[PDB]
Design an enzyme around this catalytic site. Structure first.
Site, PDB file in Angstrom:
ATOM      1  N   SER A 166       0.826  -1.201   0.000  1.00  0.00           N
ATOM      2  CA  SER A 166       0.000   0.000   0.000  1.00  0.00           C
ATOM      3  C   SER A 166       0.863   1.255   0.000  1.00  0.00           C
ATOM      4  O   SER A 166       0.540   2.235  -0.678  1.00  0.00           O
ATOM      5  CB  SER A 166      -0.936  -0.012   1.206  1.00  0.00           C
ATOM      6  OG  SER A 166      -1.776  -1.152   1.177  1.00  0.00           O
ATOM      7  N   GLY A 198      -3.599 -41.308 -26.124  1.00  0.00           N
ATOM      8  CA  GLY A 198      -2.236 -41.321 -26.614  1.00  0.00           C
ATOM      9  C   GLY A 198      -1.606 -42.688 -26.776  1.00  0.00           C
ATOM     10  O   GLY A 198      -0.385 -42.765 -26.958  1.00  0.00           O
ATOM     11  N   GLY A 246      -5.662   1.219   5.737  1.00  0.00           N
ATOM     12  CA  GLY A 246      -5.799   0.318   6.860  1.00  0.00           C
ATOM     13  C   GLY A 246      -5.901  -1.125   6.409  1.00  0.00           C
ATOM     14  O   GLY A 246      -5.611  -1.482   5.266  1.00  0.00           O
ATOM     15  N   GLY A 303      -5.768 -44.489 -29.703  1.00  0.00           N
ATOM     16  CA  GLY A 303      -6.797 -44.119 -28.760  1.00  0.00           C
ATOM     17  C   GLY A 303      -6.763 -42.627 -28.464  1.00  0.00           C
ATOM     18  O   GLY A 303      -5.874 -41.896 -28.896  1.00  0.00           O
ATOM     19  N   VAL A 343      -1.361 -46.643 -28.724  1.00  0.00           N
ATOM     20  CA  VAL A 343      -1.355 -47.155 -30.091  1.00  0.00           C
ATOM     21  C   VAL A 343      -1.822 -48.602 -30.063  1.00  0.00           C
ATOM     22  O   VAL A 343      -1.266 -49.422 -29.326  1.00  0.00           O
ATOM     23  CB  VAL A 343       0.039 -47.042 -30.734  1.00  0.00           C
ATOM     24  CG1 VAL A 343      -0.002 -47.514 -32.183  1.00  0.00           C
ATOM     25  CG2 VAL A 343       0.548 -45.609 -30.645  1.00  0.00           C
ATOM     26  N   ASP A 378     -17.573 -39.981 -28.323  1.00  0.00           N
ATOM     27  CA  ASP A 378     -17.050 -40.010 -29.688  1.00  0.00           C
ATOM     28  C   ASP A 378     -17.783 -41.064 -30.520  1.00  0.00           C
ATOM     29  O   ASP A 378     -17.172 -41.811 -31.285  1.00  0.00           O
ATOM     30  CB  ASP A 378     -15.546 -40.268 -29.675  1.00  0.00           C
ATOM     31  CG  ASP A 378     -14.892 -39.992 -31.017  1.00  0.00           C
ATOM     32  OD1 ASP A 378     -15.349 -39.074 -31.731  1.00  0.00           O
ATOM     33  OD2 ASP A 378     -13.921 -40.697 -31.363  1.00  0.00           O
TER      34      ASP A 378
HETATM   35  N1  GDP Z   1      11.332   1.906   6.958  1.00  0.00           N
HETATM   36  C1  GDP Z   1      10.410   1.547   6.033  1.00  0.00           C
HETATM   37  N2  GDP Z   1       9.167   1.199   6.453  1.00  0.00           N
HETATM   38  C2  GDP Z   1       8.212   0.831   5.568  1.00  0.00           C
HETATM   39  C3  GDP Z   1       8.547   0.817   4.138  1.00  0.00           C
HETATM   40  N3  GDP Z   1       7.442   0.418   3.486  1.00  0.00           N
HETATM   41  C4  GDP Z   1       6.479   0.201   4.417  1.00  0.00           C
HETATM   42  N4  GDP Z   1       6.938   0.449   5.656  1.00  0.00           N
HETATM   43  C5  GDP Z   1       6.150   0.306   6.902  1.00  0.00           C
HETATM   44  O1  GDP Z   1       5.055  -0.573   6.646  1.00  0.00           O
HETATM   45  C6  GDP Z   1       3.836  -0.048   7.168  1.00  0.00           C
HETATM   46  C7  GDP Z   1       2.752  -0.169   6.105  1.00  0.00           C
HETATM   47  O2  GDP Z   1       2.786  -1.473   5.530  1.00  0.00           O
HETATM   48  P1  GDP Z   1       1.721  -1.882   4.397  1.00  0.00           P
HETATM   49  O3  GDP Z   1       1.955  -1.082   3.139  1.00  0.00           O
HETATM   50  O4  GDP Z   1       0.312  -1.686   4.902  1.00  0.00           O
HETATM   51  O5  GDP Z   1       1.997  -3.440   4.112  1.00  0.00           O
HETATM   52  P2  GDP Z   1       0.898  -4.297   3.308  1.00  0.00           P
HETATM   53  O6  GDP Z   1      -0.282  -4.572   4.206  1.00  0.00           O
HETATM   54  O7  GDP Z   1       1.496  -5.608   2.862  1.00  0.00           O
HETATM   55  O8  GDP Z   1       0.436  -3.506   2.110  1.00  0.00           O
HETATM   56  C8  GDP Z   1       4.092   1.403   7.542  1.00  0.00           C
HETATM   57  O9  GDP Z   1       3.751   1.623   8.913  1.00  0.00           O
HETATM   58  C9  GDP Z   1       5.574   1.642   7.334  1.00  0.00           C
HETATM   59  O10 GDP Z   1       6.184   2.057   8.559  1.00  0.00           O
HETATM   60  C10 GDP Z   1       9.926   1.199   3.762  1.00  0.00           C
HETATM   61  O11 GDP Z   1      10.282   1.212   2.566  1.00  0.00           O
HETATM   62  N5  GDP Z   1      10.770   1.547   4.738  1.00  0.00           N
END
Ligand code: GDP
Length: 1343
Positions: A244, A767, A261, A764, A769, A881
């Site tokens: 994300s 595969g 979230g 057949g 014969v 068939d």
């Molecule tokens: N230090 C650091 N923390 C990261 C990085 N990427 C994600 N995080 C941590 O990962 C959390 C979010 O993770 P998320 O994207 O939700 O993981 P997902 O659920 O697999 O998509 C955040 O609180 C960041 O602190 C990064 O490149 N460096």
């Protein structure tokens, strides 16, 4: 009079056309291969073909459609000196093939005046014809059009209208510079000759790809195709790796401030401009908890950009974990592009290079090439970024954009031409999804609803299945539509997760689950849909007493052969799916044919006594054995990994249970966890198989080596004691068949087998014969199966697959013991092959005017095919068939019990019945397909030509288009167990006519008379052909009361006491007219050079000597009353002397007597003196004899039968003793299989017939009682062999007459109250034919 005229390779320049015009009977006119200059002027003759090719014909008359419009179909005037084409030649309705090739034609007639609606082939190549103007109607008939080397400067406008073409050859027209887009609409066209043509509107690449690509491109042009820049992109990776966060950075270009979230799937539309100058991604951020690890894989699709997010700072374990994701994507998305994107770059210079080296080691083998089963990763597909400093963010965006524009199908995805209708459908589906989301409606879209969407869309040119399917594929590619059709991946994910949140022993009753499922609406009206996809993902499977098994709710943990599977990593929920599938399969335990990938677990049939399933194992106690599978931790080569320990105990060495698990394991690993099918980059399998050493007792044999030894040898020696070998039967008892009976195994010493190409009988579907071989000296058909660490692994896999397929085929072949199914002689492991019974004759397609094999043999073949199909469908097996190639002819002898057998070598039941209908068509015709899917069926002649009305009607139903109307094989078998099915030939509607007559000949077989005085006319029916040779030909004069044929002269006695004689050469002019004292009421011919007796209305008999068909005008008069008074002392007051007419007469005693009726009595005329010498009293007054026959057939005493009018009684005398030796009542309501002894209104019988051995009594009800005599304990008796009744004649009125027209034909003539006549033609079966018919069923029932 000539029917076929063949004048070829002779001195023909001028033809005597006047002499030919007399040939009104011609069906084939062949004047080809000559120097003909004047084609004969057309004349009335039913030509089917007109071959006048290779001659000097320069022009034709405008007279083809004057005489031959309704008869001539095949015309070929090709390779002549033709200069002009008549308009009439195109005015022939019967025309279907025309050839005007190789001549000097310059223009074609106006299209408005054509009539040849059936023209299917038209070749105008090698001509000066020009641009031309083809009719419109030809679109519905033409299949082949060729205009090569024509006077064309462009594609004719009408060619675009010819939707039905399969071939279109317009080569060598250099003036042509365009192929208009509308030719793309020619969907049925696949053969094209665009040679020597300039195509300015088609790219050179499309021309190089071929005319098929040309048609596709023209369709794209027609559909206003637009360049699309939309593609699917999917973020995947281990949980909490910044998926994300990475997507937020990519979309926003800033340090993220809001990160999404908890969620399983999120979606967005991301737009990029160039660092066809922009792109759009339907981005699916796929994450969620660990429990979604092996469920999310369903959302992976092909031709999409995958981004595997990877934490750089986590270490080597992250790189190792990436193998799982990469294998999943490569398994589900073979043609996708995968980038591995690194996050946590802020937590790290050389370390980046080391990690890149690790990843590149994963994707590539040691050789440096692409490792099998992995996506193509390279230095261009690797990238690293941070989450705060945004290092490499712009570089990452450049990488995404560059890779997107590089992916291609034919050109690049980012800008490919899609039909405008596909984009319109995409808009409509997006609108539907948005509306459903607004309305909180079920996001699952049914197929009917999608059809309604595509049709409801304005100006959407999607009008067929293929267009909609291609649009569906496009929609899947852009992440608009989902199929496993779904519109919302997030809604599906929410539903599945909510089901996962349920907290019995894994089985919940259906109602409880229904109330539990209420969270995501769960509209009960949609429940059948909802539960369906629940079964698709194996989240809740229907089981037992209408309950649902929930694999995520399985309980925890509550002589012999052993196996081990070593797993490097256990997929999440593997055990749940495995145990659920095994448990459901076992609960089912409590097919296909001819070879296919479709099959069931026929390998394991035992009684399950006790079952203990749990989260990671299953123990099954069955009668005489145990079958247990458990989780364990295995160690080999000091590598510790997960494992599956399998054990079976069998009291009778029946280790088929070890197949049941193994196949299922493979199936599961092939369906839901393809990661475990693959090998690591170095060739190490991710899932290996092991057998513990029973003689080393841990020591484990690699299963690949055991299998590879099982192909040729029987023993393997362990490395720890190579001098003490162990047989494979104690290591792999699955492969070396032990469960089968000992009798079923062939002896290699008694099998003469050689894989010689000359002995190849075929192949057949799986595969194999099939060769010809000998077993114990008898011919047989032997079906033989056929099969560097990587090469060893591949060969081991193929060998295991072949052993499993052999087990399945043997299991199914062992269960077919019906007479009409090719049985199994035995099996053998070295070599791995089947032995089958061999057909003395080839397949049915090879042995094959109408009914080529004859009526009785065709009947038996059809019945036996139907019985075989009924047996197979009784075993829940489908042929799949059922062509004549697979139907082996055992014998073409009608007397044999078995004639054909159904083989597996050269859906549901309705497709089998359809193919059976096709086979019936071939049986009736002798010959013989995409058009079948469009309601087009092969054409068969009418019943009047086929002459087998019931089987033809059965064939129509079998070839029906709605499967619901097609009959079941058992129904066909049951309705064929009836003599009505076989005997009835056809029916013929003569129509309104007055009187019926017949004669012992074929010139005047069946003659109807109608009309009065000047309007008197007659009709002739040729029952042998079902055609009427004369139809109401007028012959004025008095109506005819009786008719006879003697020699080649027709005698007809009229109502005015006149016998007219017509000598055949048209009954127009009589030659003799003889006077009589009373109206003739019947006729007979005694073979004395004949003696024609006329039974008059007064009971007197007139006797006419006949010399070569010409009588003397004088005649003798034999009075019956005179004999009654003088010879036999019968008084005048006696009722026996009442004025009765002569109703029926018959020859008996080889012409030395003539028996004729006189009231209830019968009189005998002794031909020696022409005097009435004997009387018989079969009945009493006022009854009268109405028919008499002489059953002089067979090695037995001649008997004379007599029917009656009042008592409805049949009697039988001996012709040499005049003893009334049998009497029977014919008015029996249920006469079938009745009996009577012999002593050495609708139930009223009409007329006895003598059919070879048997006596046919037709009755006014329309049925026929077929009585015949046999002997029991030395006493002769008579029985009702069969009661025939053709239902088709039910609405045609009452039966009036019947007559034996030929040796093997019986014509029963019905008349309705509207004076219309209808013939019903039956096959004249004697005793032997009926007995053969009945035994054909009785014996197969017995066998
Ligand atoms: N230090 C650091 N923390 C990261 C990085 N990427 C994600 N995080 C941590 O990962 C959390 C979010 O993770 P998320 O994207 O939700 O993981 P997902 O659920 O697999 O998509 C955040 O609180 C960041 O602190 C990064 O490149 N460096």
């Amino acid at each position: 009079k000539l029917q076929e005229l063949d004048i070829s390779d002779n001195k023909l320049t001028e033809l005597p056309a006047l002499f030919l015009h007399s040939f009104k009977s011609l069906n084939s006119l062949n004047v080809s291969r000559n120097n003909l200059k004047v084609f004969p002027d057309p004349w009335a003759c039913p030509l089917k073909c007109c071959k006048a090719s290779r001659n000097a014909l320069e022009c034709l008359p405008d007279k083809m459609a004057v005489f031959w419009k309704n008869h001539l179909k095949d015309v070929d005037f090709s390779e002549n000196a033709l200069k002009e084409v008549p308009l009439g030649l195109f005015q022939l309705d019967a025309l279907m093939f025309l050839r005007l090739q190789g001549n000097q034609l310059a223009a074609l007639p106006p299209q408005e005046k054509w009539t040849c609606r059936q023209l299917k082939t038209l070749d105008l190549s090698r001509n000066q014809l020009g641009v031309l103007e083809f009719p419109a109607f030809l679109s519905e008939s033409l299949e082949v059009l060729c205009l090569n080397d024509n006077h064309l400067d462009t594609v004719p406008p009408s060619v675009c209208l010819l939707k039905s073409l399969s071939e279109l050859y317009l080569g060598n027209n250099p003036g042509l510079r365009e192929l208009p887009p509308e030719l793309g609409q020619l969907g049925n066209l696949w053969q094209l000759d665009t040679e020597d043509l300039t195509i300015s509107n088609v790219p050179a690449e499309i021309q190089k790809e071929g005319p098929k690509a040309m048609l596709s491109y023209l369709r794209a042009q027609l559909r206003k195709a637009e360049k699309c820049k939309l593609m699917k992109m999917i973020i995947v990776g281990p949980p909490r790796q910044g998926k994300s966060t990475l997507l937020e950075i990519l979309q926003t270009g800033r340090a993220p401030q809001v990160v999404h979230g908890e969620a399983t799937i999120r979606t967005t539309k991301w737009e990029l401009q160039r660092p066809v100058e922009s792109v759009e991604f339907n981005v699916w951020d796929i994450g969620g908890p660990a429990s979604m690890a092996t469920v999310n894989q369903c959302f992976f699709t092909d031709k999409a950009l995958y981004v595997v997010v990877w934490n750089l700072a986590l270490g080597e374990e992250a790189v190792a974990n990436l193998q799982f994701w990469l294998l999943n994507i490569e398994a589900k998305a073979p043609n996708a592009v995968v980038l591995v994107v690194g996050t946590h770059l802020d937590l790290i210079v050389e370390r980046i290079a080391t990690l890149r080296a690790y990843v590149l080691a994963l994707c590539r083998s040691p050789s440096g090439s692409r490792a099998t089963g992995f996506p193509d990763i390279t230095f261009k597909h690797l990238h690293e970024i941070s989450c705060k400093s945004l290092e490499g963010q712009e570089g990452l965006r450049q990488l995404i954009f560059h890779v997107t524009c590089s992916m291609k199908d034919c050109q690049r995805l980012a800008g490919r031409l899609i039909p405008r209708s596909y984009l319109s459908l995409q808009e409509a589906v997006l609108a539907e999804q948005q509306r459903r989301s607004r309305d909180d409606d079920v996001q699952y879209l049914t197929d009917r609803q999608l059809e309604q969407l595509v049709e409801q869309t304005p100006d959407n040119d999607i009008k067929d299945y293929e267009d909609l399917q291609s649009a569906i594929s496009f929609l899947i590619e852009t992440g608009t539509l989902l199929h496993f059709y779904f519109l919302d991946p997030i809604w599906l994910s929410e539903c599945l997760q909510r089901i996962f949140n349920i907290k019995k022993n894994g089985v919940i009753r259906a109602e409880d689950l229904r109330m539990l499922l209420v969270g995501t609406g769960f509209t009960q009206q949609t429940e059948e849909q909802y539960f369906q996809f629940l079964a698709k993902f194996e989240i809740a499977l229907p089981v037992a007493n209408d309950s649902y098994l929930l694999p995520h709710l399985l309980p925890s943990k509550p002589n012999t052969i052993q196996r081990v599977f070593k797993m490097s990593f256990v997929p999440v929920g593997f055990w749940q799916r495995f145990i659920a599938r095994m448990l459901i399969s076992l609960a089912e335990m409590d097919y296909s044919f001819t070879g296919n990938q479709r099959n069931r677990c026929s390998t394991f049939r035992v009684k399950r006594n006790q079952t203990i399933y749990w989260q990671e194992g299953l123990l099954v106690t069955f009668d005489g054995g145990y079958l247990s599978v458990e989780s364990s931790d295995v160690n080999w080569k000091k590598k510790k990994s997960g494992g599956m320990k399998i054990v079976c105990q069998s009291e009778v060495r029946d280790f088929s249970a070890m197949a049941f698990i193994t196949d299922h394991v493979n199936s599961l690993i092939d369906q839901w966890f393809p990661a475990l099918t693959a090998t690591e980059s170095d060739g190490t399998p991710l899932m290996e198989q092991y057998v513990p050493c029973p003689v080393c007792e841990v020591q484990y044999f690699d299963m690949e080596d055991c299998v590879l030894t099982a192909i040729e040898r029987d023993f393997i020696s362990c490395p720890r004691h190579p001098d003490l070998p162990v047989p494979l039967q104690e290591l792999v008892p699955e492969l070396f068949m032990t469960d089968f009976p000992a009798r079923l195994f062939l002896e290699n010493s008694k099998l003469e087998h050689s894989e010689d190409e000359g002995s190849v009988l075929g192949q057949g579907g799986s595969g194999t014969v099939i060769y010809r071989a000998r077993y114990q000296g008898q011919p047989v058909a032997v079906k033989r199966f056929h099969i560097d660490t990587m090469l060893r692994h591949l060969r081991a896999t193929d060998a295991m697959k072949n052993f499993s397929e052999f087990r399945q085929e043997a299991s199914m072949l062992h269960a077919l013991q019906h007479p009409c199914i090719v049985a199994l002689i035995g099996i053998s492991i070295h070599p791995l092959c089947f032995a089958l019974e061999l057909a003395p004759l080839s397949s049915l397609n090879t042995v094959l005017s109408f009914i080529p094999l004859g009526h009785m043999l065709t009947q038996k073949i059809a019945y036996q095919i139907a019985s075989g199909l009924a047996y197979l469908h009784k075993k829940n097996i489908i042929f799949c068939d059922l062509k004549s190639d697979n139907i082996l002819v055992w014998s073409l002898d009608v007397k044999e019990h078995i004639n054909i057998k159904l083989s597996d070598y050269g859906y549901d039941e309705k497709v089998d019945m359809f193919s059976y209908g096709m086979v019936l068509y071939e049986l009736l015709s002798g010959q013989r397909a995409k058009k079948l899917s469009k309601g087009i069926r092969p054409v068969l002649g009418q019943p009047e030509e086929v002459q087998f009305r019931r089987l033809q009607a059965l064939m129509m139903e079998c070839w029906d288009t709605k499967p619901e109307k097609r009959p079941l094989a058992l129904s066909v078998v049951s309705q064929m167990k009836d003599p009505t099915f076989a005997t009835f030939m056809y029916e013929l509607c003569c129509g309104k006519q007055t009187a019926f007559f017949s004669s012992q000949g074929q010139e005047y077989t069946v003659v109807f008379w109608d009309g009065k005085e000047e309007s008197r006319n007659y009709t002739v029916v040729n029952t042998e052909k079902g055609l009427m040779e004369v139809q109401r030909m007028c012959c004025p004069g008095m109506k005819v009361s009786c008719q006879l044929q003697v020699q080649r002269s027709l005698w007809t006695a009229t109502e005015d006491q006149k016998i007219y004689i017509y000598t055949l050469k048209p009954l127009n002019t009589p030659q003799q007219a003889l006077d009589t004292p009373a109206v003739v009421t019947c006729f007979l011919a005694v073979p004395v050079s004949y003696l024609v007796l006329a039974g008059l209305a007064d009971g007197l008999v007139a006797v006419f000597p006949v010399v070569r068909g010409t009588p003397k005008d004088s005649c003798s008069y034999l009075c019956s009353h005179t004999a009654n008074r003088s010879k036999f002392s019968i008084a005048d007051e006696d009722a026996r002397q009442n004025p009765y007419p002569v109703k029926a007469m018959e020859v008996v005693n080889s012409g030395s007597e003539v028996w004729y009726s006189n009231g209830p009595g019968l009189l005998v005329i002794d031909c020696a003196s022409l005097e009435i010498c004997r009387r018989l009293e079969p009945y009493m007054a006022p009854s009268m004899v109405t028919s008499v026959v002489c059953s002089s057939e067979g090695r037995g005493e001649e008997v004379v039968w007599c029917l009656d009018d009042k008592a409805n009684s049949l009697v039988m005398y001996h012709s040499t003793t005049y003893q009334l030796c049998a009497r029977y009542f014919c008015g029996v309501p249920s006469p079938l299989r009745d009996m009577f002894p012999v002593r050495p209104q609708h139930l009223q019988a009409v007329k006895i017939l003598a059919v070879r051995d048997l006596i046919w009594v037709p009755r006014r009800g329309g049925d026929v009682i077929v009585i015949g005599l046999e002997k029991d304990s030395g006493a002769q008796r008579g029985r009702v062999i069969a009661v025939l009744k053709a239902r088709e004649l039910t609405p045609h009125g009452v039966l009036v007459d019947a007559a034996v027209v030929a040796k093997d034909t019986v014509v029963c003539t019905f008349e309705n109250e509207n004076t219309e006549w209808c013939l019903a033609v039956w096959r004249g079966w004697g005793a032997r034919e009926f007995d053969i018919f009945y035994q054909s069923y009785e014996e197969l029932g017995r066998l």
